[PDB]
Design a protein around this ligand. Structure first.
Ligand SMILES: *C[C@H](NC(=O)OCc1ccccc1)C(=O)O
Length: 212
């Protein structure tokens, strides 16, 4: 069911934060553990600020905090080009339950179109289920990211789900789950943007985990 998939997502969601060494942590959004010490996270969380590699990354797992130098996480792309969401290996994180087989197969993508979905996310660790209207797929989606200094950047990714719904700051990095039971309520991707009552999630397929 949606609710049981949601519980699996919930247990693998951690809070992602960034800080200078010996400085205060800014909690930014969610990241999703997928297998072993690999997580999915929107790279817009960190990559557009100066000297990101000199920062400490923090992973809050239910009130137990794991940190690592940003230069010591291993980042792997999902596909060629900018996809925002990346795979990130964090050697200091406890192993995750493997949820890769719960993600939609590329061939089954059409089965989630025109159907409801649920964004399974948190705001700063507080779990939320957010209803999304019948889904469409955008071959290219563009959204605006606001940096810490107020300046903005336009981001464009390939293959992003679009659904009517109401998101809040901090919900990025949560997982979109299909209402379609016939594909076992597959996880469809990762929330990257919300606005004008539109929620946007980068498609992530089972096949993309082959990138290791
Ligand atoms: C949610 C996970 N399920 C899973 O990996 O399913 C793979 C499967 C299940 C049944 C038949 C064939 C393959 C889990 O944690 O087990």
């Amino acid at each position: 069911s949606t609710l049981e998939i949601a519980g699996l997502v919930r247990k693998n969601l951690v809070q992602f934060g960034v800080g200078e060494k010996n400085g205060s942590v800014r909690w930014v959004m969610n990241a999703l553990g997928v297998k072993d010490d690999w997580l999915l996270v929107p790279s817009h969380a960190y990559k557009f600020e100066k000297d990101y590699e000199m920062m400490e990354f923090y992973f809050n797992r239910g009130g137990t905090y794991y940190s690592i130098s940003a230069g010591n996480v291993v980042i792997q792309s999902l596909d060629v080009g900018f996809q925002d969401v990346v795979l990130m290996k964090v050697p200091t994180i406890p192993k995750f339950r493997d949820i890769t087989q719960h993600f939609i197969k590329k061939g089954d993508v059409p089965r989630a179109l025109n159907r409801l979905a649920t964004l399974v996310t948190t705001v700063n660790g507080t779990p939320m289920l957010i209803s999304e209207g019948p889904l469409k797929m955008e071959e290219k989606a563009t959204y605006v990211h606001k940096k810490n200094d107020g300046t903005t950047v336009d981001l464009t990714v390939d293959q992003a789900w679009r659904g009517k719904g109401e998101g809040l700051p901090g919900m990025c990095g949560g997982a979109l789950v299909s209402s379609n039971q016939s594909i076992q309520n597959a996880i469809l991707g990762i929330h990257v943007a919300g606005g004008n009552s539109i929620l946007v999630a980068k498609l992530v397929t089972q096949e993309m985990f082959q990138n290791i």
